[PDB]
């Protein structure tokens, strides 16, 4: 017989400080009424935020995910949790009469998160090509996923979590594999399709705050 929506407070959620826009939106929590804590039932919340509403002029077919970790009061602070690829894009990129290449590898950064990274690469039809197939071999595939496993670890073993984001806001890896695999067989549609965090470290409090200035 009572409306329970006046028993709530709206909070805000922020981003780390290598992006542009800080605000994401508002998320209501119950008051701390007796035992249950409004910081507690809000802290474990995940925000699916597309990158073109986090930047000014970048692509829109990439998404990030941001959990919450700490309560400041009308302020949640967020950390990187993973990256997704839109079903618009991936299904608008897989088409017949071309060859699909996938890969996946695990890596631990210098402070430790156990990132799992996936990838994909499609072969490109040439300019004057009249042969319809444009298939690859199998030894040229295995000599391609050897390079993608060499590169994701090589770009990741020697830095922290703050700088691989700056190596994922552009397409700097897909550019690199496209130009270090153009020698064997010319591929055009290269992405890292999912980055997943496995095992987060100890909750040190102000490495985040360093990520908020």
């Amino acid at each position: 017989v009572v409306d329970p929506f006046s028993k709530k407070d709206w909070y805000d959620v922020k981003a780390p400080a290598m992006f542009n826009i800080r605000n994401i939106g508002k998320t209501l929590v119950t008051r701390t009424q007796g035992t249950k804590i409004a910081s507690d039932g809000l802290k474990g919340r995940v925000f699916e935020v597309s990158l073109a509403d986090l930047q000014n002029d970048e692509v829109a077919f990439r998404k990030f995910k941001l959990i919450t970790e700490d309560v400041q009061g009308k302020n949640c602070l967020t950390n990187f949790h993973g990256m997704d690829l839109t079903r618009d894009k991936m299904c608008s990129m897989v088409k017949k009469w071309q060859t699909m290449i996938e890969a996946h590898v695990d890596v631990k950064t210098t402070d430790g998160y156990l990132l799992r990274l996936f990838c994909v690469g499609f072969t490109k039809k040439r300019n004057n090509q009249i042969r319809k197939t444009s298939y690859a071999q199998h030894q040229q595939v295995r000599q391609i996923r050897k390079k993608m496993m060499e590169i994701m670890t090589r770009e990741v073993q020697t830095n922290d979590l703050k700088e691989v984001v700056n190596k994922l806001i552009p397409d700097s890896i897909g550019k690199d594999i496209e130009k270090a695999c153009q020698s064997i067989y010319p591929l055009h549609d290269v992405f890292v399709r999912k980055v997943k965090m496995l095992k987060k470290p100890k909750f040190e409090l102000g490495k985040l705050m360093e990520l908020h200035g």
Partner: protein, 136 residues
């Protein structure tokens, strides 16, 4: 029912979930987490005939009520997650979609981003039905 914002400065976002079967149609408006909900109404609550649980007019009679229950609480913009039945079963969203989206966009909201969240399996199990299949 409270609001801390200013109108034209920003748009307060929520998010909906447009479930669309061949016999029933959900609309479930939640928040950015999805964990916290706002309102939920089905097609089946409004029409007293189970052979048109999912008529397109039965989504309009509930979508107008959702945007009517939400304007008292202060939401201007919505994201959309569209969703079929999914799985090993069919994957075509039924007819209760394209007249319920227009039905609330016409009813005065600010439509944001549009995507698909239909649960496509990588490798299905066996669908219910024989090798000769449901024949009739």
């Amino acid at each position: 029912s409270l609001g801390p914002q200013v109108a034209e400065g920003e748009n307060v976002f929520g998010v909906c979930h447009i479930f669309a079967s061949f016999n029933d149609t959900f609309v479930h408006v939640t928040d950015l987490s999805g964990k916290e909900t706002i309102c939920r109404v089905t097609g089946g609550m409004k029409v007293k005939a189970d052979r048109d649980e999912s008529s397109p007019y039965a989504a309009m009679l509930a979508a107008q009520d959702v945007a009517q229950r939400c304007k008292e609480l202060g939401i201007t913009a919505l994201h959309i997650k569209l969703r079929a039945t999914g799985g090993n079963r069919t994957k075509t969203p039924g007819p209760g979609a394209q007249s319920a989206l227009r039905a609330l966009a016409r009813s005065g909201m600010k439509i944001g981003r549009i995507e698909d969240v239909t649960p496509i399996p990588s490798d299905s199990t066996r669908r219910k039905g024989g090798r000769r299949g449901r024949r009739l």
